Amino acid sequence: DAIARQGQSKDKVIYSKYTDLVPKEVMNADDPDLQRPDEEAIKEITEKT
Amino acid sequence: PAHINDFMFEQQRRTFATYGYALDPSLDNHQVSAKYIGSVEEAEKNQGLTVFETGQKKTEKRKKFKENDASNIDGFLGPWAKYVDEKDVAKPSEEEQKELDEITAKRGEEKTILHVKEMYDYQGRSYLHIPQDVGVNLRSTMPPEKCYLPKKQIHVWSGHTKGVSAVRLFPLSGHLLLSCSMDCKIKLWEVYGERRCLRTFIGHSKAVRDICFNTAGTQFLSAAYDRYLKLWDTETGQCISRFTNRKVPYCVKFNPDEDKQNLFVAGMSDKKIVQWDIRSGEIVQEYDRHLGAVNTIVFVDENRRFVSTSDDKSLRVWEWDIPVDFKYIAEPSMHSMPAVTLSPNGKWLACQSMDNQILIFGAQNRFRLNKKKIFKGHMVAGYACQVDFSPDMSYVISGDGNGKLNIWDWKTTKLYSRFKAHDKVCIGAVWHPHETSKVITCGWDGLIKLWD
Amino acid sequence: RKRKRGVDYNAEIPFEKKPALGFYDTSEENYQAL
Amino acid sequence: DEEELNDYKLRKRKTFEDNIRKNRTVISNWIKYAQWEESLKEIQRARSIYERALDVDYRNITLWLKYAEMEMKNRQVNHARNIWDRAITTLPRVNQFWYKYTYMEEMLGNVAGARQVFERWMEWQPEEQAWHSYINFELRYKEVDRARTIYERFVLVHPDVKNWIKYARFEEKHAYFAHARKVYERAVEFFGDEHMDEHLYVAFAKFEENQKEFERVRVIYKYALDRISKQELFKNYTIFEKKFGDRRG
Amino acid sequence: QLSKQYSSRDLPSHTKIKYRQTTQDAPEEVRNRD
Amino acid sequence: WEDADFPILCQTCLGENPYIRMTKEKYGKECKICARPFTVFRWCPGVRMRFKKTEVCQTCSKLKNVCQTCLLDLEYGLPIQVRDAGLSFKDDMPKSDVNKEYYTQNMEREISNSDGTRPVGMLGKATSTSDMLLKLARTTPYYKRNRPHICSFWVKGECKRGEECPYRHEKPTDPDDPLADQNIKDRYYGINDPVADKLLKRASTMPRLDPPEDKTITTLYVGGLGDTITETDLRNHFYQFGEIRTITVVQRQQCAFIQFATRQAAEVAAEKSFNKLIVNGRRLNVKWGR
Amino acid sequence: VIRMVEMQKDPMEPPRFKINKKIPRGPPSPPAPVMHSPSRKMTVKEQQE
Amino acid sequence: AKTVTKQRVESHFDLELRAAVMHDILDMMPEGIKQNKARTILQHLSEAWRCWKAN
RNA sequence: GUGCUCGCUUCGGCAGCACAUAUACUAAAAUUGGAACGAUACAGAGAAGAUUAGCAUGGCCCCUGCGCAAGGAUGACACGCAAAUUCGUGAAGCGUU
Ligand SMILES: [Mg+2]
Ligand SMILES: [Mg+2]
Ligand SMILES: [Mg+2]
Ligand SMILES: [Mg+2]
Structure with a gap:
């Protein structure tokens, strides 16, 4: 991951692992994973933008 | 982005300006005390008074005038009233004024440095005294018993800062050699002994073009690039006379006749050759039947005739001070001739023709071009290679801009040696008439060599 | 002379990128001539 | 060599520069510029050249290739390894990268490095032939412990009966018959009831025929036939031929 | 490096956004509707 | 263009009064x-001293880590040729027009990813400021810099404005001096700075410890000891710098002699110690003994 | 402690500098890694199809 | 960034038609692995147009 | 410098108070370096046999125009064309005999 992110900040997401290639499974339409930010954060980011 | 007030900063700045010490401003988290910084003991003895706060000063107020009547027609200096202890015209020293005119020339100031610690020798005698410590008479008349080709470097003079344009042998001795460099220096090296540079002459505003040694050897006429030449002495080194027609001279030759050794003939690029007396100083006669740049003119037939060359291919033999070019030569095939040297027999004018080869003519007989004497193998187109003859008329020396010192057997018309003379344009290749092996070279290379 | 990109070639590597280095000993490495 | 040569260089350089200026896409000009440089032996020039070309198109296998080929022919071996790892980092699913990396590592001798790069490589579970060259590499050495570790990993990332078979193949040849027995057990109990079929079992019966245990050859044969999905018809004729074999021999 | 050149078309024009009013179809009524 | 907080220049160029006054012009x-x-x-340099101005891009500065007005390095303050060589530093900054513009553009792009604290690149991986640089470094503010030019009027006589000659009305320097015409661009590029060659000649003639002939002369005479020194203190001067084999502290002549266990260790200690190994303030002389 | 003052810009002053300078585009970014499925070479038959 | 006015209407239609082709199949329904001969499928396209026009 | 001190205090000064508070690319220069589309001359005009209309694409080429319009020989330059590719050369590597 260093050779990948070479000369780059800790912001960059650099997918080079197989554990990214592997299909995750999800079966809950009621997980946290499948939930958007709630509109309070949304109005904050609207105002900043 | 600290926030401060200003009036106190301006008071601090007034102090720090006119009293020279300041309330130290460092706002360190290490609690310093209020300390006077700068001229510390000045603030201490002055009790810290700032340039703004009133305090007693018996300092002499600079002497001023006061004309405050605005009724005067030419009066009111009023608010603008000069201080009375001031000068009228701020004129800087006559010394720096003369030096500034001289420097405005320098970018010509006649400037001479003798590198010899004692300018005259152990008798009080100027180095114009020809040696007796010589192993052979440098005042002899006869040709060397046998001059040959060189095989090793002898000495190299460093002391010119750029390309050299001439080396003049002091007549009849070869004990002095003036070396003219593009850096405007005419530096005479003692050609024997230590080989070290003797005199350094300057005074031009540009490159040092040529110098001609007088038949007395005490004088030399040096033409340059900025339209003027100097008739200079040797031991004082300065110009006794100034030659100037405001024209661009390329070469100059000093007449050897003792009753005419003041008669100097300086070629000018404007069709001209000037015949001028040093003593009077004006042009005494004109030779204006050339076409343009007259590269060089030389003596012939007891020096009462002058040979000339042109880049217009006009080659001339016309008597000294007789202004009618009564012997003219310009062939269809003959190309520019830069340099012409008379064989020490006085029978031939060997002129390096810029067709990359040297041509010999009979200088005593009817302007005859001897094609049996045609020296081959140089590259002289664009360069003025100074070629010469040894005293025995057996050997010729020749330069090429390719670094080539060629040592030819002038009879067999072929070279016996071809070696590295210079790195830049090998300009002067001069055979010594009283030395057997000596080939002295100057060039655009700034190093001045003897080979033997 | 007035040659605005002519000498970019005989003089310098025209637009240069230094080979990025990774996990190995590159300094004392060097090469022989022609 | 002062200036006739030098100006010939100046020309050819200016040309290549203008051709890549026009396109700066398709790469033949980039290459030919660079190889001309390498033939004139200025590898600093050629290096910057390959970096720029790689910038414009970092998905070019031939570009990566001949870059590293320059580095290897000039044995800046450290530089070459950096090149190879960057390659196999950005274009992993290209195989010849991995290959040439190993091969050069091998004639370099750093076989510890070769092992770990093969571990890297297999993290992607590349390919059958990849595994197989891994194993031929390991058995250029004694390292049979390694080899069976790799057959372990390979047959168990890849559910193939013939993979099982080649594992027991190597056990038989390098003479580990007890391990061959374990692997036949494991294989048949993993493949098992449903989609397990003839050929692993014919191989088992044949190995025990090498063992000349005829009664257990019979029992394994008919017991497997009967316990698992039996037969189909051409394979059953093959079962009849193999039956004559197992009974006679 | 911001130039001072300019354009007839970039002169200020249409400087207020018409917001969609109450009766036309505001995002509120879209929040409601069936 | 760029945008700044304030300049970057040495103390000499920077000034003396506690309150400095400088006017800003954006994109000037x-x-x-x-x-x-x-x-x-x-910036107003000094009383009747020439007002200076920032004379290089702040990125053009952070590139080589030199003074945006004074032009000399900010750590030592010697010609950039010198300081670079004193770090043994070898920068590849491009020169031709298009090459230089491309270089400057990508340079500003790469410097945009910085935090504004220190120069970029080898400027840190060459930060071993050698005692050569330390010793060539000037000590006090050579504040002759803020004196004006040669008032060409006042050189010919003409400067009729009284004392207000805009320039120092002194004798003008003979430009034959190599210390006269150093083109600012060349001085920045480290290109044939005659003042830098002068610093090279000076730091070449400046005294350093001499090497002996035979390798088996591993005895080192340190002259000028005094009787405040200990044998363990001579050791702690030359002890972990290698291994010492023996030491003779000559009190009848106020010197010392370290016989070493590593020749290169002896060289390190002594050559670094030449006249500057100042423990408790005594000027010792490191040489190889007889 | 330093006083910064902003020097007047003269109103009737034309632009000062030649803005329109062209150079090639700067080198891009650290290339991403190609996270591709295993790619299959085609039969020569397919190839001729 | 000049507009498309009245004299570049046909020229522009063809820039974009043949761009669209080159996007469309000759690089998104290949499997002519080598080098997909897009320069020649475009030559067909221009001869298909000439033949339509000449019937 | 201007005023006033119930200042000495004469109409001389000295003094105190107040008031009044920081200009300025310092230069008349001296430098130093490139173009003038002008001469000079060389040069010397897209596609298909000839004679010719154009509109574009590409970019470390520009010019005239307020211009995101239009023009400048279709403004100029773009020119090897690589290219694989058809048969064989070989090397590397895995598997069978
Ligand atoms: Mg045609
Ligand atoms: Mg047009
Ligand atoms: Mg037209
Ligand atoms: Mg066009």
Whole structure:
């Protein structure tokens, strides 16, 4: 991951692992994973933008 | 982005300006005390008074005038009233004024440095005294018993800062050699002994073009690039006379006749050759039947005739001070001739023709071009290679801009040696008439060599 | 002379990128001539 | 060599520069510029050249290739390894990268490095032939412990009966018959009831025929036939031929 | 490096956004509707 | 163009009074290095001393870590040729027009990813400021810099404005001096700075410890000891710098002699110690003994 | 402690500097890694199809 | 960034028609692995147009 | 410098108070470096046999125009064309005999 992110900040997401290639499974339409930010954060980011 | 007030900063700045010490401003988290910084003991003895706060000063107020009547027609200096202890015209020293005119020339100031610690020798005698410590008479008349080709470097003079344009042998001795460099220096090296540079002459505003040694050897006429030449002495080194027609001279030759050794003939690029007396100083006669740049003119037939060359291919033999070019030569095939040297027999004018080869003519007989004497193998187109003859008329020396010192057997018309003379344009290749092996070279290379 | 990109070639590597280095000993490495 | 040569260089350089200026896409000009440089032996020039070309198109296998080929022919071996790892980092699913990396590592001798790069490589579970060259590499050495570790990993990332078979193949040849027995057990109990079929079992019966245990050859044969999905018809004729074999021999 | 050149078309024009009013179809009524 | 907080220059160029006054103009003129518009801050140097101004892009500065007005390095303060060589530093900055513009553009792009604290690149991986640089470094503020030019009027006589000659009315320097015409661009590029060659000649003639002939002369005479020294103190001067084999502290002549266990260790200690191994203030002389 | 003052810009002053300078585009970014499925070479039959 | 006015309407239609082709199949329904001969499928396209026009 | 001190205090000064508070690319220069599309001359005009209309694409080429319009020989330059590719050369590597 260093050779990948070479000369780059800790912001960059650099997918080079197989554990990214592997299909995750999800079966809950009621997980946290499948939930958007709630509109309070949304109005904050609207105002900043 | 600290926030401060200003009036106190301006008071601090007034102090720090006119009293020279300041309330130290460092706002360190290490609690310093209020300390006077700068001229510390000045603030201490002055009790810290700032340039703004009133305090007693018996300092002499600079002497001023006061004309405050605005009724005067030419009066009111009023608010603008000069201080009375001031000068009228701020004129800087006559010394720096003369030096500034001289420097405005320098970018010509006649400037001479003798590198010899004692300018005259152990008798009080100027180095114009020809040696007796010589192993052979440098005042002899006869040709060397046998001059040959060189095989090793002898000495190299460093002391010119750029390309050299001439080396003049002091007549009849070869004990002095003036070396003219593009850096405007005419530096005479003692050609024997230590080989070290003797005199350094300057005074031009540009490159040092040529110098001609007088038949007395005490004088030399040096033409340059900025339209003027100097008739200079040797031991004082300065110009006794100034030659100037405001024209661009390329070469100059000093007449050897003792009753005419003041008669100097300086070629000018404007069709001209000037015949001028040093003593009077004006042009005494004109030779204006050339076409343009007259590269060089030389003596012939007891020096009462002058040979000339042109880049217009006009080659001339016309008597000294007789202004009618009564012997003219310009062939269809003959190309520019830069340099012409008379064989020490006085029978031939060997002129390096810029067709990359040297041509010999009979200088005593009817302007005859001897094609049996045609020296081959140089590259002289664009360069003025100074070629010469040894005293025995057996050997010729020749330069090429390719670094080539060629040592030819002038009879067999072929070279016996071809070696590295210079790195830049090998300009002067001069055979010594009283030395057997000596080939002295100057060039655009700034190093001045003897080979033997 | 007035040659605005002519000498970019005989003089310098025209637009240069230094080979990025990774996990190995590159300094004392060097090469022989022609 | 002062200036006739030098100006010939100046020309050819200016040309290549203008051709890549026009396109700066398709790469033949980039290459030919660079190889001309390498033939004139200025590898600093050629290096910057390959970096720029790689910038414009970092998905070019031939570009990566001949870059590293320059580095290897000039044995800046450290530089070459950096090149190879960057390659196999950005274009992993290209195989010849991995290959040439190993091969050069091998004639370099750093076989510890070769092992770990093969571990890297297999993290992607590349390919059958990849595994197989891994194993031929390991058995250029004694390292049979390694080899069976790799057959372990390979047959168990890849559910193939013939993979099982080649594992027991190597056990038989390098003479580990007890391990061959374990692997036949494991294989048949993993493949098992449903989609397990003839050929692993014919191989088992044949190995025990090498063992000349005829009664257990019979029992394994008919017991497997009967316990698992039996037969189909051409394979059953093959079962009849193999039956004559197992009974006679 | 911001130039001072300019354009007839970039002169200020249409400087207020018409917001969609109450009766036309505001995002509120879209929040409601069936 | 660029945008700044304040300039970057040495103390000499920077000033003396506690309150400095400098006026700012955004996009004021062109960095003769970055070639593009920069900001220009103009500082009042000293009493009747020439007002200076910022004379290089702040990125053109952070490139080589030198003074945006004084032009000398900010750590030592010697010609950039010198300071670079004193770090043994070898920068590849491109020169031709298009090459230089491309270089400057990507340089500003790469410097945009910085935090504004220290120069970029080898400027840190060459931060072993050698005692050569330390010793060539000037000590006090050579504040002759803020004196004006030669008032060409006042050189010919003409400067009729009284004392207000805009320039120092002194004798003008003979430009034959190599210390006269150093083109600012060349001085920045480290290109044949005659003042830098003078610093090379000076730091070449400046005294350093001498090497002996035979390798088996591993005895080192340190002259000028005094009787405040200990044998363990001579050791702690030359002890972990290698291994010492023996030491003779000559009190009848106020010297010392370290016989070493590593020749290169002896060289390290002594050559680094030449006249400057100042423990408790005594000027010792490190040499190889007889 | 330093006083910064902003120097007047003269109103009737034309632009000062030649803005329109062209150079090639700077080198891009650290290339991403190609996270591709295993790619299959085609039969020569397919190839001729 | 000049507009498309009245004299570049046909020229522009063809820039974009043949761009669209080159996007469309000759690089998104290949499997002519080598080098997909897009320069020649475009030559067909221009001869298909000439033949339509000449019937 | 201007005023006033119930200042000495004469109409001389000295003094105190107040008031009044920081200009300025310092230069008349001296430098130093490139173009003038002008001469000079060389040069010397897209596609298909000839004679010719154009509109574009690409970019470390520009010019005239307020211009995102239009023009400048279709403004100029773009020119090897690589290219694989058809048969064989070989090397590397895995598997069978
Ligand atoms: Mg045609
Ligand atoms: Mg047009
Ligand atoms: Mg037209
Ligand atoms: Mg066009």
